[PDB]
Amino acid sequence: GSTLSLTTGTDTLTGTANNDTFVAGEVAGAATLTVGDTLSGGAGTDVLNWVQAAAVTALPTGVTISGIETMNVTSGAAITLNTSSGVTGLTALNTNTSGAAQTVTAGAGQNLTATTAAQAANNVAVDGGANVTVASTGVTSGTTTVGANSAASGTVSVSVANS
Amino acid sequence: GSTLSLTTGTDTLTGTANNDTFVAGEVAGAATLTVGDTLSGGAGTDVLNWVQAAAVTALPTGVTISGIETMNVTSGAAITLNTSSGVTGLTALNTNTSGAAQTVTAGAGQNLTATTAAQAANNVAVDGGANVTVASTGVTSGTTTVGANSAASGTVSVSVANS
Ligand SMILES: [Ca+2]
Ligand SMILES: [Ca+2]
Ligand SMILES: [Ca+2]
Ligand SMILES: [Ca+2]
Ligand SMILES: [Ca+2]
Ligand SMILES: [Ca+2]
Numbered sequence: 001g002s003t004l005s006l007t008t009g010t011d012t013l014t015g016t017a018n019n020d021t022f023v024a025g026e027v028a029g030a031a032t033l034t035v036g037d038t039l040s041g042g043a044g045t046d047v048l049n050w051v052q053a054a055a056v057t058a059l060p061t062g063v064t065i066s067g068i069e070t071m072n073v074t075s076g077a078a079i080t081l082n083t084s085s086g087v088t089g090l091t092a093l094n095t096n097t098s099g100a101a102q103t104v105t106a107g108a109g110q111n112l113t114a115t116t117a118a119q120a121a122n123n124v125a126v127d128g129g130a131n132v133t134v135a136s137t138g139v140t141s142g143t144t145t146v147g148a149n150s151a152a153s154g155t156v157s158v159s160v161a162n163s
Numbered sequence: 164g165s166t167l168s169l170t171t172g173t174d175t176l177t178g179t180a181n182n183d184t185f186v187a188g189e190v191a192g193a194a195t196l197t198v199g200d201t202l203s204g205g206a207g208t209d210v211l212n213w214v215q216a217a218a219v220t221a222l223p224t225g226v227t228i229s230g231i232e233t234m235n236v237t238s239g240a241a242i243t244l245n246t247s248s249g250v251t252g253l254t255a256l257n258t259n260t261s262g263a264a265q266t267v268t269a270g271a272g273q274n275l276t277a278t279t280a281a282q283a284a285n286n287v288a289v290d291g292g293a294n295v296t297v298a299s300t301g302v303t304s305g306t307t308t309v310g311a312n313s314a315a316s317g318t319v320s321v322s323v324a325n326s
Contacts, residue, residue: 003175025173025199032173051173051199051225074199076224098224 006032017042041067169195180205204230
């Protein structure tokens, strides 16, 4: 497939109907998933990689992801996002912190996986989704908490490591 | 092979499975190894050249280097990096200072070489790696120190010149 890059602007990106991958990285340390961004996939080998130094905070205004099967979200700080709306066609959501909190809610139909390194006193909380997986290492004080607001459609699989 | 250039953005670079070389220089004196950069090698003639006026500090968030055999790191200031993770497939790490400190840790299986010109009162400290080599010139006050925290798998070979 083809590889498509988001900018610090408003992007209107449309995939090849093939193995295509969407990059929502940084530009000068400025986020590229931004207001009004609309992304569209085509055929079923579609990936969105969202990577940011800054904390993920929510989906930004007017953003719509569609036809993209896998969403990877990685932050230098906390993640807080909800994906029960704006996002359609998403089978797999993977969220990644190292050393800060996570507060994620997925739509049913989406397999959530919340990987967290060096969790320390930070709290993971996840909700909704189809199959959920929590994978937390370096844990300490941190609560892990699943389905407190909305249960999973499928299986829960927490795992937690402490040193 | 083919020759691939990193930008001040998020790069998704994939080698030919051949003699390919990856350039991670500067753009306006802004680093090109940056958040979310993912690099991928293929076959075994793979080189990453990372060159920066600014001190090397750590691998940036979400960066994954993979399938790349040789990593060259050159800085106008200090180097501090650990490569026992994030980097996979790495047989050779070479780090280069001129007139500032070095604090490097390599994974076993990786041959470390820490070359330092005009060391002066700056301290070299290295750890881990397979074969390690320290090559220090213009030395003065500077301590040289190997395996204080983790020994080498193979041979140590320090050499130190003072004027
Ligand atoms: Ca597609
Ligand atoms: Ca954008
Ligand atoms: Ca698709
Ligand atoms: Ca880059
Ligand atoms: Ca290659
Ligand atoms: Ca290779």
